[model samples]
Target: SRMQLSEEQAAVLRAVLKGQSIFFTGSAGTGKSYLLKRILGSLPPTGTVATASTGVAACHIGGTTLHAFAGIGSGQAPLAQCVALAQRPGVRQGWLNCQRLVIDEISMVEADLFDKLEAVARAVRQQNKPFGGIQLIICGDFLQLPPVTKGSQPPRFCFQSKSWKRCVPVTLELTKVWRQADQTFISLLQAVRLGRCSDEVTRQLQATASHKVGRDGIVATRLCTHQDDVALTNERRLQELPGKVHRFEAMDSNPELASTLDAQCPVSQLLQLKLGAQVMLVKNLSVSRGLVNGARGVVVGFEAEGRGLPQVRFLCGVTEVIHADRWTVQATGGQLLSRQQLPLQLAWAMSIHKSQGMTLDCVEISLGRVFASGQAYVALSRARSLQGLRVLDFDPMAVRCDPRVLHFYATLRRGRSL
Candidate 1:
């Protein structure tokens, strides 16, 4: 579907076409990802590289993960090691040949990782210019999600990076909400993004607890607090169904890569299917036909003929036989890792974190185990309408953002005249 960009989005696109380095921010449902698709489509073919901070986000932009694309690996290693890593054969060429770099979901990128990216870009290109003269177009809202901090390490936002001001001169803030038209739903998301959930807002959300949120003919999965819970829930649900198990083995290129494919690959290596199991497309098999990631479906048994090939009927009424698909995980040190497997995964349940970039027409979010500050907000914002969302054990306090990130956005907003 062709999108009609608002005046603000059109102006930002013009700046991008003019080779301006822009750092764009927008709240959820504001078409950040949609605008990003337009930007990617409009960029020059060979020189541009699109990447995201996470696997899911990278999939959204049809690009590789940022760390993998940069050859910097985790970005937690020594800066000297990262610079050396960037100079390797495959990695060195990737950095040098790329002229435009688009990093999506910028909020999840830690300050140090971001700075390391800038360092490697300059070191590889040997240019004194900002980002080695590569036009940088980074997009994400600091208010929606903050960097993941572990143990004793302090959280450093990318906006606070030393080279942020130098590398990103234009700050584009998109205001229109293209996903949700309901003003009430739009206003609710805006308040949640900034951690400003009020008493009435809480009451309105609670009122939808008992509402029905099913679509077409599918009962939505419960969004869990932890990955383990979702895994166990789906596994248990599969076990309850009585049928001969159908096992599909994945084709592998590298043994070491295959060993870790279950964790990294969007789809499972050994897919155990039943007659009526719920599943989701883990790869972009036929995006034009809606067989992309997050697409929901049900296993409708196997091919009736020779050795049974598992077939699935999607919510869109398209039934496709699960086929072998490939996903590559490029290591930070310039190694290309690949895994070939079925392009589907169980979707009876999913984690809120996993549902970050998805828009669900119908969803049942279990907030009892929501541990993070903005977890509930992210989960709720995934729905297209308030009627399509149902919450269990909802909590008012979970609708919050990191204070430091909130402050950073506030400062940026003050700096922007409009």
Candidate 2:
């Protein structure tokens, strides 16, 4: 498998093969899901495995939502109802017959949803065996982003009632980062996640070859001032941005993958953008929910909210009085009511969350407020092999977000758990 298991991972795989419950927590982009799939592929043919993921990845393994997968959960009907799901008819027997269970992306899953699924797994295959005894594997990066109000629905209940403090924790961290050609960018992230990152790493980075950017404002003179300027600057990047349509629909009593919307999609290719800098609305919000959720708005102004609280306004009119790291702006397109309207004047920078895995050359790069994952690295490292890197308006937030890494092994990770 191109997906290699660190020595730590191999031990965990063996334990899973023997039917043990496991928990794994790793940062984003670290092949956690890939590892889970590899484990499934290696399972004994005689043993049946039941699987499920969060709404974002449910279609991957052809299973139900964490809610439906557990049929016994409170919010939705039972998994046995799968026979009636028009979308996935008669999938239950296929699920329970499996000897093992794997739940992916459990970071934000409600505890109740998991409980129900566990109950069902035990009923079908475990026959009241110790809960989590069926070789269960749950994976996700849990930094506390939860499903908020979606559409007209008020809020989907989560089983936060049960504490993950009770579940097992296995984490596999990928130490090598492919995006950083320069060590400074990676070190900056390390400095932020752990207090131990180097001070010299900051002084060593090259200067900007591009512009000074923020959520929606340019620090000095900007080459690309308007959306048209952004278009002139780059179009392929724009094309990759809106490729984010939630592949499944939740409007029905049952969520399914058959529907497509008549609107702009969320920017999924964002790993292409990173950190949350220089970005803006390329498309108008003509559809229903025009693109702003708890999304980052452009920097309109900054000041002290009270005594020491720093504050700024986004193009959408939302104001934040916290450190720069606490929020971000994102360009979005959606049919949902909450995401309507072209909030800004049409020119802005990208988020760090959008900047993972890319290495751009001196080709007129931009600055801070980049929030795609590993965006900090991609933005600066994009400079031709690092010498071309230039940064502007980089007021490091006192606290930096943690960069996610992939983890594949259950036991090896546990052994190395910090």
- The lDDT per prediction is 0.78, 0.39
Off by over 4 Å in 1: 149-152, 215-217, 259-264, 283-292, 311-338, 368-370, 415-418
| Top lDDT prediction, candidate number | 1
Estimated TM-score per prediction? 0.90, 0.45
lDDT of 2 by residue, 1-418 (tens): 2656766556667666656667654433345555676777777655444344443244334333444443332435655552233123233454455456677655445445455555555455546554434555666544323333222443322324243334443333445444344455555544533323244544443234343323244221122223455445344433444333112111221123112211112322111222222333323233233333223343333343432322334433455533311111111110112122222221233332222222232223343443422234333433323432355544343223333321222324565545
Root-mean-square deviation of each candidate, in angstroms? Answer: 2.7, 15.2
Model 1 lDDT on a 0 to 1 scale: 0.78
Q: Write the per-residue lDDT of candidate 1 for residues 274-388, one digit (tens) a residue.
A: 9888887766678678776677788887987764778888776788887677877655444666777778778789987777777766678755543565667778888888887
